[PDB]
Design a protein around this ligand. Sequence first.
Ligand SMILES: *[C@@H]1O[C@H](CO)[C@@H](O)[C@H](O)[C@H]1NC(C)=O
Ligand SMILES: *[C@@H]1O[C@H](CO)[C@@H](O)[C@H](O)[C@H]1NC(C)=O
Ligand SMILES: *[C@@H]1O[C@H](CO)[C@@H](O)[C@H](O)[C@H]1NC(C)=O
Ligand SMILES: *[C@@H]1O[C@H](CO)[C@@H](O)[C@H](O)[C@H]1NC(C)=O
Ligand SMILES: *[C@@H]1O[C@H](CO)[C@@H](O)[C@H](O)[C@H]1NC(C)=O
Ligand SMILES: *[C@@H]1O[C@H](CO)[C@@H](O)[C@H](O)[C@H]1NC(C)=O
Ligand SMILES: *[C@@H]1O[C@H](CO)[C@@H](O)[C@H](O)[C@H]1NC(C)=O
Ligand SMILES: *[C@@H]1O[C@H](CO)[C@@H](O)[C@H](O)[C@H]1NC(C)=O
Ligand SMILES: *[C@@H]1O[C@H](CO)[C@@H](O)[C@H](O)[C@H]1NC(C)=O
Ligand SMILES: *[C@@H]1O[C@H](CO)[C@@H](O)[C@H](O)[C@H]1NC(C)=O
Ligand SMILES: *[C@@H]1O[C@H](CO)[C@@H](O)[C@H](O)[C@H]1NC(C)=O
Ligand SMILES: *[C@@H]1O[C@H](CO)[C@@H](O)[C@H](O)[C@H]1NC(C)=O
Ligand SMILES: *[C@@H]1O[C@H](CO)[C@@H](O)[C@H](O)[C@H]1NC(C)=O
Ligand SMILES: *[C@@H]1O[C@H](CO)[C@@H](O)[C@H](O)[C@H]1NC(C)=O
Ligand SMILES: *[C@@H]1O[C@H](CO)[C@@H](O)[C@H](O)[C@H]1NC(C)=O
Ligand SMILES: *[C@@H]1O[C@H](CO)[C@@H](O)[C@H](O)[C@H]1NC(C)=O
Ligand SMILES: *[C@@H]1O[C@H](CO)[C@@H](O)[C@H](O)[C@H]1NC(C)=O
Ligand SMILES: *[C@@H]1O[C@H](CO)[C@@H](O)[C@H](O)[C@H]1NC(C)=O
Ligand SMILES: *[C@@H]1O[C@H](CO)[C@@H](O)[C@H](O)[C@H]1NC(C)=O
Lengths: 791, 199, 393, 37, 50
Amino acid sequence: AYTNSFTRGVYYPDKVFRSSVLHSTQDLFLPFFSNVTWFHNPVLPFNDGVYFASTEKSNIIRGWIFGTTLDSKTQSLLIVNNATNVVIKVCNNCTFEYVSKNLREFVFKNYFKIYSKHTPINDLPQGFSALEPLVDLPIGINITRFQTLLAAYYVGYLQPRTFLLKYNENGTITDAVDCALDPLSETKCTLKSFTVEKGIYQTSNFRVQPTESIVRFPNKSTNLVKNKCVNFNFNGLTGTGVLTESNKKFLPFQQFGRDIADTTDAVRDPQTLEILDITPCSFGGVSVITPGTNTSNEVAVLYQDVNCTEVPVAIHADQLTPTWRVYSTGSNVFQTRAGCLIGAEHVNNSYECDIPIGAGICASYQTSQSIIAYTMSLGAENSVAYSNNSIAIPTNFTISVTTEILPVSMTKTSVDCTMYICGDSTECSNLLLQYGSFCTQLNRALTGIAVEQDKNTQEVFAQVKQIYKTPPIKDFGGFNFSQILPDPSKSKRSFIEDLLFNKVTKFNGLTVLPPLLTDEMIAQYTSALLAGTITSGWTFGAGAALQIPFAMQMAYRFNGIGVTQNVLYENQKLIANQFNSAIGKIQDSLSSTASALGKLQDVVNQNAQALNTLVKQLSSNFGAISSVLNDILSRLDPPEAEVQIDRLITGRLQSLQTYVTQQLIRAAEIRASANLAATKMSECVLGQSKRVDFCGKGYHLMSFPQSAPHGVVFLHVTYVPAQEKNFTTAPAICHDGKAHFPREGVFVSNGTHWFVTQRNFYEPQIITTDNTFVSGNCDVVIGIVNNTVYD
Amino acid sequence: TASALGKLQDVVNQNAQALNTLVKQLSSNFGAISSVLNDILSRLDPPEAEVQIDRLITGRLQSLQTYVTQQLIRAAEIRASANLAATKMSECVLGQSKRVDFCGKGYHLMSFPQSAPHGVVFLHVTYVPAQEKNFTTAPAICHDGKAHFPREGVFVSNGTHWFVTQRNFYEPQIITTDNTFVSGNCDVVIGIVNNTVYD
Amino acid sequence: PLSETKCTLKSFTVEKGIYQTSNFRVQPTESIVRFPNITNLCPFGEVFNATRFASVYAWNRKRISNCVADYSVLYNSASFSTFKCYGVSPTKLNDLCFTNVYADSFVIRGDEVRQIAPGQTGKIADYNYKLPDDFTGCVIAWNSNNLDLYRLFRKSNLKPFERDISTVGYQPYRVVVLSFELLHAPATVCGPKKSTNLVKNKCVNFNFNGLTGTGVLTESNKKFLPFQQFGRDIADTTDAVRDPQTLEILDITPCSFGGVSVITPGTNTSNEVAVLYQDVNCTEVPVAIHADQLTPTWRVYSTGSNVFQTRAGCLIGAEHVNNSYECDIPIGAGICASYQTQSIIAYTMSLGAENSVAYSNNSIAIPTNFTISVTTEILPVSMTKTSVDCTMY
Amino acid sequence: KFNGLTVLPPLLTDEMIAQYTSALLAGTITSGWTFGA
Amino acid sequence: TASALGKLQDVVNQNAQALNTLVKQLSSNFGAISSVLNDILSRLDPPEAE
Ligand SMILES: *[C@@H]1O[C@H](CO)[C@@H](O)[C@H](O)[C@H]1NC(C)=O
Ligand SMILES: *[C@@H]1O[C@H](CO)[C@@H](O)[C@H](O)[C@H]1NC(C)=O
Ligand SMILES: *[C@@H]1O[C@H](CO)[C@@H](O)[C@H](O)[C@H]1NC(C)=O
Ligand SMILES: *[C@@H]1O[C@H](CO)[C@@H](O)[C@H](O)[C@H]1NC(C)=O
Ligand SMILES: *[C@@H]1O[C@H](CO)[C@@H](O)[C@H](O)[C@H]1NC(C)=O
Ligand SMILES: *[C@@H]1O[C@H](CO)[C@@H](O)[C@H](O)[C@H]1NC(C)=O
Ligand SMILES: *[C@@H]1O[C@H](CO)[C@@H](O)[C@H](O)[C@H]1NC(C)=O
Ligand SMILES: *[C@@H]1O[C@H](CO)[C@@H](O)[C@H](O)[C@H]1NC(C)=O
Ligand SMILES: *[C@@H]1O[C@H](CO)[C@@H](O)[C@H](O)[C@H]1NC(C)=O
Ligand SMILES: *[C@@H]1O[C@H](CO)[C@@H](O)[C@H](O)[C@H]1NC(C)=O
Ligand SMILES: *[C@@H]1O[C@H](CO)[C@@H](O)[C@H](O)[C@H]1NC(C)=O
Ligand SMILES: *[C@@H]1O[C@H](CO)[C@@H](O)[C@H](O)[C@H]1NC(C)=O
Ligand SMILES: *[C@@H]1O[C@H](CO)[C@@H](O)[C@H](O)[C@H]1NC(C)=O
Ligand SMILES: *[C@@H]1O[C@H](CO)[C@@H](O)[C@H](O)[C@H]1NC(C)=O
Ligand SMILES: *[C@@H]1O[C@H](CO)[C@@H](O)[C@H](O)[C@H]1NC(C)=O
Ligand SMILES: *[C@@H]1O[C@H](CO)[C@@H](O)[C@H](O)[C@H]1NC(C)=O
Ligand SMILES: *[C@@H]1O[C@H](CO)[C@@H](O)[C@H](O)[C@H]1NC(C)=O
Ligand SMILES: *[C@@H]1O[C@H](CO)[C@@H](O)[C@H](O)[C@H]1NC(C)=O
Ligand SMILES: *[C@@H]1O[C@H](CO)[C@@H](O)[C@H](O)[C@H]1NC(C)=O
């Protein structure tokens, strides 16, 4: 009888307290969802370590016996528990002695370590319970078999498997992940987290192992094997690859062929005058494609650059868990240009890309729900009804507000060079003094980056000479502006600014310098810019601020984009309502989703990852006897302590140099982004921009700035036509033998009558010498149309 | 003012300091018994001179790599600055720019180039209003039940009379059909006022 | 501080600004050694003075724990021909504390004496007795010709620390190897080091079972399990330690440190400076700046009436001013410093003159005049074409 | 690919890039800047 | 003509040259007595092979 072990049998790997930390350890652990034999007397082998489970209340089981032969000729160990006493012996010829409804778990491993746990239960239960160490017997005995002294118990065997342990605030293990259970758990272990976001993650490395070794010597030699990755040995040079027939013709005195980069590609075998190619056997990456962890646990596996029929072989599929073997076969394979994709159903339909794979292939979690792989769709097919006498003219419009987010600055991290490399060590400092001024160079570069961050922030935000305030009367012609104007009733930031700020959320020589401008000052600058823009248009940026009603400012903007002011003057209420609705939609989207500020989240995550890597680089030996400078100094003499300290110094100096170089490149990127943001605030906010798609999609009317953690957000108010109608158009109108052309507009016809209308809004007008101008005769213009012109 | 050209002097100082650090890096032992190849070779046999020379080679190669990486980053920054300068020469100098604050504060009239050590200097001539006056304004004018809007400018009032003026300079004009156009009626415009339009 | 700034800048003239000159550090005040109170003398007599030693192919092994070893007698004894230690220095045995000791004793020939070392091969060093490449211990060899079997061969080379039993320079030399266990475990075999008292809330140099360090020891409320001896943080660094003599958990906080910046105007203007101690309270500034070991001029910038606590650190030597002006020398968190009536003043930077535009729905401001302004813009274009001959360099 | 070197294919194929450019050309020819606005 | 599209060809050449240099760097001894890992392992002892 076999029973599923669920996820039980996890003990404490070491005696080190940990709290609120995810720690990955490598030791002998019971595999998750394994099979344990159920005995309902028998002698069983020990292997590496034994997990014992008992479900009893009457305490039938009393002890254990361990050994090899269990009858003389060796030492056998024995444990017996009676009443409130426990006796352990290695018996005579005794060399050791020790005296010290219910589910009891025990773990025995070889020094003999015994971990124990006791729980109440009401059929192995489903749950988690860590095992605290209880017994450590200094025996040094070889055990390969054991038996139980007494009616039902479970026996399982431990294996060398890596686990990711989760510690709570009180130091008790709550959850764990078996890194070799399935691709999802491997992804969790690689990400060092229990939650995985949607996407593709490169987790593993796949390589074909050699199957046999062949040696060929000229007249101890073996027979050559073709079409198999083998460990060959021709003459004097060794290698691993696949030997196949080749059409190359070597010269009689030549034995090997080299590629352009000094790489051997063909070899002539010594026994026979034959040339064999050498191709490396398959290798590549193994990536896991998953949706959100809380969405589904289904995953797909992609093996880059491998034939899809050789995936099961050379991946040790037979040596992996049965859970992983699902992702090697199953008639659900798909050979793409990137590689063989297993676990995703191929769909002939095309949708928008969700998770890219390569060569136009995308995967998604769509309909039962399963992973589907398809070819990405470039968009909706369209065909413009083009003709030489038809024009489409809009009759309505929509006011749309879009959002753009740009990073501006970073966190000013300052790394104490000497404290990081040789912290609290005079000998280490003296040894480091021989390396010149690398340390001063690193400090200077970091200081330059820190100053550049403040320069970026000042350039982006400090663009207004004075501080402007909105009047107490907010009669702005129907426009609300209350969502973006500052709220003094509470850090006097606006509602949207608060949403943005809430959306995004010191030792070994590492420090963080505060920015020169505080969030309150940045909010003050943004409020001044908003007040100036609302009250004076672009006059505040051109010079002294000149007040103007907001309706007249919007009329200015429409005239600038090419629409007459009357459109605003008798569509004012509709335009104001559309603007208010757009602002409300922006607020709702910001309050709902959290991926809008991913541009700033990426910068924060990159900086945090770099800092964490720098911190973790201090635990490496770099070839030394230990990674602790104090331990090296207290253990070794100066003649050898110097060598160990030199190794550590070289490693840590290399780590610091790498960190500084990466920080410099990232700072260059952030400075470019800050320059772009400064230009956008100068052009979109302080004026009206005619550049296409610079200040959002559509005809840009205006823009509003907001401050976000280490960045600026632009709300781009634009004009977009909505409904269009067909009309018949003519390049010119012939009235009295002279061609007529419109001053500003197009000629259109509803079927019987001809009018002149503006480009971006349908407004027919009587053709008149005030609307048109005369130029030339009617015999030159192609497509002229006879009509009359009013006078 | 001596510190007017600090942008170019910063580049000069950075390059000079990098070169000075690279030169001073030759005085470091890097773990060897001495920083002089000639002294090492004259004092020691090839078996140990090899170790000393290897230490010196490693140190000096690391110094060169650091210097070259810093120089590459600085060169990329200078290339970005040169591209910006070329764009400014094309737009501000060879034409009139409508971009705000691209060619100086104010309404950019024109610009002049001058040379400087490893740099270019732009003298931006711009227009800036100086003195401003208050006026009463209306969105449109009612004359005969029809709304009149200015062709180019705004309506202003000195207290009793209504004129039409351009945006950036006060120049009152008689409100006529030459500078006003008719569109719509008087019942829809918000804030319309009553006046006369001369024919 | 001004002369220190000059020394760091390698110049006799210092431009106006704030410069990073030196570093802040609190020196330890007390030395703490805490060892278990074990009076059991470690029994090395049964290992060293034993009359009968087993053969080389059946080398005798003994395990030592729960004792206070004294290697000074063995080191000072002249009865040992050679005493070679590899992972630990001979003189640091008296100070270091181990967990377990393995004593392996046998008898070999003088030629094979040199073969008892890591990374060695031979008749005995490869087919009879092996040592790990990272062996940590000491080998003691001495002749016994005046005081008082080799294996031929086998199938292959036995793995280190494995014993298999199946089926002039010629004088006998007794060889005893003491291998120390350095695994992650509570220390058990210590040396004869006298323990001291325990002091808290002080920057001290502690020593818990050989775990050297420096920091401030404070009582913590961590829920340590009975088998847990110490704790680690997110960065895998020691955070709490259990007292070897008392079931008490002590939190370790490293002694205070930070940066020291000097804010000065031009030397042509004034010789007065201000000092900023980054990320530290103003209470610990004088006690750790070594003022009573520094020059009398350095004592001025350690205390005084002009002490300002800012978000960027503690500012000493600058007078706080309620008014706000344009920034002159930045400090952090909106704080700026300047040289004005003169002395160094610290204030909050001003963002500009306040203004309110007289907005209304029927009023417009129109210019009547204008001005023509010419402004200067400077952009770098190129650098110096420097080529360095790497081979000749 | 001999010593751990791999070349990942681009997500967008040459045919897809050509389709983008053809759509842009068709929109420009038959509509002007209205398709972009 | 032939030099019209040199901008893209320069990028291709730079990438190819960088890859070629990276692969070619595997033939250098870097101070060791041999550049072949298998030869070093089969010819030296672990104390020096390390
Ligand atoms: C492992 O256990 C499961 C569940 O009890 C069972 O279905 C399966 O047959 C077992 N495996 C073997 C090899 O018996
Ligand atoms: C324990 O003894 C068995 C029986 O010969 C043997 O096969 C095994 O290798 C031994 N294990 C150890 C660690 O000595
Ligand atoms: C942790 O300890 C605290 C004691 O303050 C207790 O309230 C809490 O329930 C404990 N949590 C767990 C998971 O044991
Ligand atoms: C080597 O010996 C084999 C024996 O069968 C023979 O076939 C082959 O031709 C020989 N090659 C040379 C080069 O002598
Ligand atoms: C996402 O997954 C985490 C992990 O359990 C869960 O706590 C969270 O509620 C999930 N999100 C949603 C919206 O359900
Ligand atoms: C992969 O293996 C199949 C085996 O049927 C073979 O036909 C094919 O040529 C191989 N290569 C590719 C790229 O499919
Ligand atoms: C999917 O499309 C391919 C064309 O490449 C076709 O051969 C196949 O029959 C289609 N499958 C289905 C289920 O329609
Ligand atoms: C334009 O659309 C709005 C709604 O978006 C609608 O209320 C209005 O009536 C439309 N105008 C015309 C002329 O159709
Ligand atoms: C603006 O919108 C708010 C709701 O967001 C509303 O309470 C208010 O009355 C509106 N008008 C003004 C002038 O604030
Ligand atoms: C204009 O006419 C074409 C063809 O008659 C038609 O496809 C198109 O939809 C029409 N436009 C509108 C706005 O209806
Ligand atoms: C448009 O083209 C058609 C031919 O397709 C031609 O008959 C007609 O005259 C043309 N009209 C104009 C206005 O060019
Ligand atoms: C316009 O009138 C307001 C109302 O007090 C005043 O504040 C402002 O200074 C006036 N404008 C000018 C240019 O004087
Ligand atoms: C301006 O607002 C006032 C309300 O205080 C109103 O009476 C007046 O008609 C408005 N004038 C214009 C031109 O909007
Ligand atoms: C006995 O052991 C002691 C160490 O305490 C040593 O000094 C002495 O030489 C030993 N006796 C002999 C005969 O070696
Ligand atoms: C000796 O150490 C024990 C802990 O092992 C402690 O309880 C006891 O108080 C100590 N006694 C003295 C005198 O130090
Ligand atoms: C200091 O400044 C004054 C002008 O205020 C100048 O005359 C003098 O030469 C300067 N000192 C030096 C050493 O240059
Ligand atoms: C000063 O000490 C207090 C507690 O006494 C604590 O906030 C922190 O350690 C220090 N504060 C600052 C701002 O450095
Ligand atoms: C002036 O400074 C003192 C000293 O901190 C402070 O208590 C007081 O509130 C300040 N006065 C004003 C008006 O800020
Ligand atoms: C305009 O300003 C200039 C000086 O810049 C002055 O000479 C001129 O009289 C002013 N004109 C008016 C109308 O105020």
